[PDB]
Symmetry: C2
């Protein structure tokens, strides 16, 4: 069945979103610090 | 404006999804271990 494929696809999408939020966090750190 | 509100809403939704994936992970650890 493909429940585990669906789960892994959704997980990868969520991880990608979290990468973008961490991208933003570090941009904001640089504005704060420099 | 509301970009930062939208971002925090999306982030909370993604963190909630990761909590569910970690819930599943621990269930599967117990099936593997016990
Ligand atoms: Na599968
Ligand atoms: Na805002």
């Amino acid at each position: 069945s493909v429940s585990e494929i669906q789960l892994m696809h959704n997980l990868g999408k969520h991880l990608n979103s979290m990468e973008r939020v961490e991208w933003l966090r570090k941009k904001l750190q640089d504005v704060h610090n420099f």
